[PDB]
Design a protein around this ligand. Structure first.
Ligand code: HEM
Ligand code: HEM
Ligand SMILES: Cc1cc(N)nc2cc(-c3ccc4c(c3)[C@@H](N)CCCC4)ccc12
Ligand SMILES: Cc1cc(N)nc2cc(-c3ccc4c(c3)[C@@H](N)CCCC4)ccc12
Ligand SMILES: Cc1cc(N)nc2cc(-c3ccc4c(c3)[C@@H](N)CCCC4)ccc12
Ligand SMILES: Cc1cc(N)nc2cc(-c3ccc4c(c3)[C@@H](N)CCCC4)ccc12
Ligand SMILES: [Ca+2]
Ligand SMILES: [Cl-]
Ligand SMILES: [Cl-]
Ligand SMILES: [Gd]
Ligand SMILES: [Zn+2]
Ligand SMILES: [Zn+2]
Ligand SMILES: [Zn+2]
Lengths: 401, 401
């Protein structure tokens, strides 16, 4: 039972939950690969039994009448057809636990309040689009954001797969130039090459919302324009640097991840888009300042008349904080839910203490929980953490091409 | 071999050196513990065998007459005496390799320019003190700092260890104040308690330099005062915040770690203090802002007339950036060597590139290489890293008391 210490306060806990870790990670006694982003058939019954055991233990109903009984139906379901369907409440519970079990997510203090839309009866790419648009409108909620996931039909043999080709539901275009370099978001250059390839005509701007590329089984992808008034966006202004707004920067409101594979009870949902709300450093520091992203940092520092001539002026650090201040200010003035990295990490500490008494520990990936600016100024920095894989879970998956 | 990617640039290397990892660390496929701070004749022979191999590799005489002769010499000496002695050239090579191999050190681009003082003929605590003072004088060099290590006699059978009780050669006292607070540095309350118990008359300021407690074999530790003019200090001022000088803050020029064990070819040196120069964030973020250290952040932010009632004003990040500006400015003004986290991480990337061509990889602890502020503004952030333990090496050891 690994001993975990908080070096800021002196407390010591022991992670007994790590004992249940199923799928194995990348690290070995010889070498640690914690920093890697992508870590390097009746088996279905075993994962089905375990998940059903979780559910009934969580409702204080372990080893009961209905517990035995539901063990039977799944045993018989797979016996007959080689797979099973989840009860409605089980799909809800599996979704919530998969969020609870996500080691890189700092927002898990919210894990209990998740809205699970059931799209398991989907059938076409036009159907997907209306399922996706009800999600986006419900999650957006005119700016008072609400966690939500939509669960499209699971995977089965013989049939293709439901897949969303965009990494997120809302993404900005990436256009190459007569010199390679990009107008718009360089992260999405590839999918923009496909959106054009499948019919979309590119805009000219740095903030053109990409069209969705939705894929019903076996039939190829199909483009879908997003409705403008459905995509809530925030123009960025600074509370006191009056020139900042003229930089023309905007970002959108809803972070909606649409390429991960929800895995519950041995079933695999390759299309299960989830959305919460942003931590402000995701926008200000990662999306806007990463050198391979919008890379605005030097442009903001010139407008502040900082000494960009030497690193020891900390010009990068100063411009980055102001970029973040403007993000916080703009989202608040637009009445759109956002949380700063100090509030977020403080709630995660609260989550760790809750998870300690409830389950005897919590899987956490230090390198992703600690924010990318001002790390040691947040209480998670001095907190040791254990990283392991519990189930249900969200996993990465190959691109559908 | 683990595939390692730099996400900023898209480079891809394969760390083949990790396969020679001469010991095992805390992680398993079940659980990563990378964030934890603290993770016989024939085996002495096999460690010695591998180091002699390393040494004769670095002087391009592998498998020569002089190489085989040296293996024969060492085995015969372990047979006659249970141990063996390093040649001077082997000691200099082994001390440089230990630095080169230290996975949490961002300043390793310097690893080859290290001044090695051989004090293995040291006799008493009093001589120990003389060697130390000359180390401090050579490394400080009136503010133009140089990298140095002084090596005291090795652990050997029949006699106790030389030990430096102090964690660093220069530390500020930490006195438990009356009500319950700490005046001075709180990390040093224990060593301060010991120094008093051993006859030190205690000051009562915030920046009182601690005496050294030096332990000769099978002797109690002995108290030595450092000559005031040996300890170069830097008063802290801010280039444009003139009330900052009124805080009375100071820091010392020389970081000299004195409580780690140096391991070379199976031999162990429990006393081998080493010194470099500071990276500014150790002083500004860690030493002054850590809430369990001097904890000046709120006092600074209040003086800046920031709004410290809501965290979304990023007052913490603003105040910390200005504390780092003052450290860099104060050290430059005093003509004392110092490096900022942007220049340091930039040279570490060159080190990674140099090391990949030389040994085919480089052990690095990502959570320690990334600075505690502005992490993703530095190029080491988006570089994946492999952590593992090579020897020669510096190791932690228990406190002698
Ligand atoms: C509601 C507030 C939420 C906040 C503030 C939040 C914040 C974050 C942040 C900052 C990251 C790390 C990104 C990075 O460091 O690059 C992350 C990752 C993640 N989030 Fe959350 N999140 C929230 C809700 C959710 C929800 C509702 C789900 C799923 C139902 C979820 C699932 C995940 C997963 C699986 C990851 C890890 C992705 C990966 O491993 O690549 N989060 N989140
Ligand atoms: C000359 C400039 C140097 C710089 C700028 C530097 C910088 C650093 C920093 C910033 C850390 C980690 C501290 C933290 O993250 O809180 C570190 C760790 C370390 N450094 Fe260096 N260092 C230098 C020289 C040296 C030398 C000369 C040696 C030994 C010969 C050395 C050996 C180590 C070791 C062993 C660690 C790990 C400490 C631990 O495991 O707790 N460094 N260094
Ligand atoms: C639900 C949610 C909320 C939020 N507020 N943020 C989130 C960020 C990610 C995320 C996951 C993986 C990757 C990224 C983001 C990338 N943006 C950074 C590394 C590449 C892989 C995923 C989900 C998030
Ligand atoms: C060590 C590390 C820690 C962390 N906390 N975050 C990290 C995020 C990336 C990363 C950054 C940007 C992008 C990606 C990964 C790609 N996965 C997605 C496409 C390009 C955008 C890489 C390394 C990271
Ligand atoms: C040579 C050197 C130079 C420098 N410029 N800095 C250095 C910082 C450390 C260091 C050593 C041990 C510990 C720390 C720092 C602390 N950060 C806490 C971790 C374990 C104890 C060690 C050596 C350093
Ligand atoms: C996860 C992690 C990463 C990192 N990069 N650094 C870390 C430094 C400490 C740490 C903080 C304060 C103190 C210590 C360690 C102890 N070593 C004693 C020295 C002062 C108190 C704890 C955790 C750290
Ligand atoms: Ca200028
Ligand atoms: Cl994003
Ligand atoms: Cl220090
Ligand atoms: Gd001023
Ligand atoms: Zn980034
Ligand atoms: Zn690991
Ligand atoms: Zn700290």
């Amino acid at each position: 039972f690994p001993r975990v210490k908080n070096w800021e306060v002196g407390s010591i806990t022991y992670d007994t939950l790590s004992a249940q870790a199923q799928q194995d990670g990348p690290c070995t006694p010889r070498r640690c690969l914690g920093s890697l982003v992508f870590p390097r058939p009746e088996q279905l019954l075993s994962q089905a039994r375990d998940f059903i055991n979780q559910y009934y233990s969580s409702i204080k109903r372990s080893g009961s009448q209905a517990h035995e009984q539901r063990l039977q139906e799944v045993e018989a379901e797979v016996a007959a057809t080689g797979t099973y369907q989840l009860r409605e409440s089980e799909l809800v519970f599996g979704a919530k636990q998969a969020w609870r079990n996500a080691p890189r997510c700092v927002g898990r203090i919210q894990w209990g309040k998740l809205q699970v839309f059931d799209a398991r009866d989907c059938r076409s790419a036009q159907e997907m689009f209306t399922y996706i648009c009800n999600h986006i409108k419900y999650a957006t909620n005119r700016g008072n954001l609400r966690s939500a996931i939509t669960v499209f039909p699971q995977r089965c043999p013989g049939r293709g797969d439901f897949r969303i080709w965009n990494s997120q539901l809302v993404r900005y275009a990436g256009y190459r130039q007569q010199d390679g370099s990009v107008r718009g978001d360089p992260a999405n250059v590839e999918i923009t090459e496909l959106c054009i390839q499948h019919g979309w005509t590119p805009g000219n701007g740095r903030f053109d919302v990409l069209p969705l590329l939705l894929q019903a089984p076996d039939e190829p992808p199909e483009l879908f324009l997003l409705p403008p008034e459905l995509v809530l966006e925030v123009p960025l202004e600074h509370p006191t640097l009056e020139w900042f707004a003229a930089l023309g920067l905007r970002w959108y409101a809803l972070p909606a991840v649409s390429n991960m594979l929800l895995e519950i009870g041995g079933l695999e949902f390759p299309a299960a888009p989830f959305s919460g709300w942003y931590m402000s450093t995701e926008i200000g520091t990662r999306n806007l300042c990463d050198p391979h992203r919008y890379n605005i940092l030097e442009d903001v520092a010139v407008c502040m008349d900082l000494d960009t001539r030497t690193t020891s002026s900390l010009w990068k650090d100063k411009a980055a904080v102001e970029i973040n201040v403007a993000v916080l200010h703009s989202y608040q003035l637009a009445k759109v839910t956002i949380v700063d990295h100090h509030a977020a990490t403080a709630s995660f500490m609260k989550h760790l203490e809750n998870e300690q008494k409830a389950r005897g520990g919590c899987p956490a990936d230090w390198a992703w929980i600690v924010p990318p600016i001002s790390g040691s100024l947040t209480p998670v920095f001095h907190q040791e953490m254990v990283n392991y894989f519990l189930s249900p879970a969200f996993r990465y998956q190959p691109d559908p091409w």
